[PDB]
Design a protein around this nucleic acid. Sequence first.
RNA 1: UUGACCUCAAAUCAGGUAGGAAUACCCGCUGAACUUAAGCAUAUCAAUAAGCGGAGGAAAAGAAACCAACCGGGAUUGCCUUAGUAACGGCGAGUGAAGCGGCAAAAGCUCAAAUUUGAAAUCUGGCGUCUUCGACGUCCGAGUUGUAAUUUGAAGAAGGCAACUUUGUAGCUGGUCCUUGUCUAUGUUCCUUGGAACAGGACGUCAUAGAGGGUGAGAAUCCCGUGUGGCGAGGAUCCCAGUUAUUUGUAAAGUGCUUUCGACGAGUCGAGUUGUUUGGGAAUGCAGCUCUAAGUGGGUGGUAAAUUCCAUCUAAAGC
Lengths: 52, 197, 67, 98
Amino acid sequence: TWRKWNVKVNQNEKRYATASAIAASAVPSLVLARGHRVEKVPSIPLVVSDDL
Amino acid sequence: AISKNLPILKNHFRKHWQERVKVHFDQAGKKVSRRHARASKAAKIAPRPLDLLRPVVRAPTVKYNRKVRAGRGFTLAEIKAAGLTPAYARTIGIAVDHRRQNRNQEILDLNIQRLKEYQSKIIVFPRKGKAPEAEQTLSAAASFPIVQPVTDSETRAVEDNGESAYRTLRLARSDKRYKGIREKRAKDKAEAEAEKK
Amino acid sequence: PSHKAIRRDAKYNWICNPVHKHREARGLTATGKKSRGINKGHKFHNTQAGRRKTWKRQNTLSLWRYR
Amino acid sequence: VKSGIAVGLNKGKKVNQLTPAPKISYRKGAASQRTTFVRSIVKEVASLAPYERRLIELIRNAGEKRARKVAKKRLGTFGRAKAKVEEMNEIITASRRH
RNA sequence: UUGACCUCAAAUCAGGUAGGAAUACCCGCUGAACUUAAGCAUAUCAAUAAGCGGAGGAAAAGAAACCAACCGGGAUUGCCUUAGUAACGGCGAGUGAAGCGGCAAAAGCUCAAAUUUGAAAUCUGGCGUCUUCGACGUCCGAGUUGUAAUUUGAAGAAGGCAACUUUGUAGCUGGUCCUUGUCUAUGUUCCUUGGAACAGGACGUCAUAGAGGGUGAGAAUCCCGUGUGGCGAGGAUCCCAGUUAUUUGUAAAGUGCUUUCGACGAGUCGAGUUGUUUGGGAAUGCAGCUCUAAGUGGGUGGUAAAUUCCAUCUAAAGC
């Protein structure tokens, strides 16, 4: 049971990677390469109204 | 057994250590048990806070005398100074400690202010009939925090008088080393042999 | 403990409880707690809370999820 | 009173000092007026111990010092021999004289 | 001659109580060697396995004869640090704590030692009656070689002077907490393959339900469920809320001033010596044996003594 299961990571290193992932949400080349049928959609960084 | 150019370690694993191993898998689950316990206690008690109101206290030793910290109980002198009995205070949410003493006017005042601030802000319901409820505040430490005393004047005069702080320490330390023999050298020569004269 | 004078009277009622079965054997008497060596002080470190309890605590490897 | 410095005789910080009022438990070892009365009655009833019956014989013969050395072996420490030998002289001055 | 008291017996006397089981964890006693040191004897494995006694859902510990030398902390228990450190050790191999600091959780208390002495005020059993985990009344016994009230060192008591702020005991309904029972959406339409559609294709429906399982092959929509919320029943009851009886009271508690006192645990503490154990080193604790105290006394302040001061607690009874 006492083998190493979980792994500690630096707090700044997570926030570096999480910030770069939010940059990857935009830019159409990386989205289509990673699956997703996004041919119809007018532009990306897609925002919707607060009635949703 | 030994030999490259490595540091000499000290690993204490020659007993049956594998039989007495603990792994804290429960950390995550045990946290929820405590949050459930703190919540369910507040439901039973209802309008009162979970914590007892603690006093302000100075710490011991050379390492920690420059900082203040929340003590155990309010003493019998300070409870009297505000204007109430020790037996009554235990049922209002005020911790009492019969063994702590007071040898400082600064800590004596601070905790009298702390009791007067407490007594004013709390309300008390009677035993008989009406009870106008006013929600519950959980943490007494949140409403009554601990602040560090300020002994500061940011801008100040520069009063020099050619004494030298370094020279003051060397003279003062020399007095502690030599007062034993200097008393006994004075107890001879000037006393005993010359009191006989 | 079974006699009704001891059961009803509140001063000597505590002894009737099931936790005080054979105090002499386990060493919960006046002479027992002296022989075990249970006193407050720097002289009493190796036995104070419990001799085997303290040994079982400090001869144990405590490991967390994040090392 | 402290001297106002980290190194010295008094050592160190100056404060508004006094006072703690005295507790009840500090008195503890202080006498009477039962206890001295009861201990007076429990003496005539009855007699001294065998080792004490040598002490007064030793004082009549070889005074002090030898009285301490005998008492130090029979009792615990040197400080207890001070109390016993000083007390045994007060028996001779009170009871035997006058 | 008759009746008491003190010690000790008997009975298939009236009524109770103890044993064994299980043993993961918990409290004690008892106690190895393989092994490591490249040999082996102190050491190490280990104050461990096997053996013996005793408990509970927890156990043990616990309201300082404590830690400190600071501007001082303030019952116990555990986690993170202290630290692989101060010490121990053929000073070899190896062993190895605790104070402060940050958190989780916090709750405090009871006897003995005083004369109710203008009223043994107290308690078991028997017999009777009631609303029966009990309450009321009555008759023997226990007990003055000490059962109630009163007080526990944080104090506290006995007097005098002085202002008074507080009070209590049953059941009934409802909530609350458990054990439960039941109710609450939507296709089995058409065509190909096949022994069998739960497969493929076309057209819909429900979704706070597209978890999982069942049915002749990968089913949200065939069945049980799942999700959302209702509605019962049966216990626990003082935890809260709201009521109704009562009926406690001239008795129980708290506080300002002033005078006199202020009871505190003995074959114990402490000393010597032997064996064992600890990191504890002119000896950490425990046990056997010999010696044996005190009243401002006794304990501790990590180098043996004598001499003089200071700081700290109040042991030898208990929850």
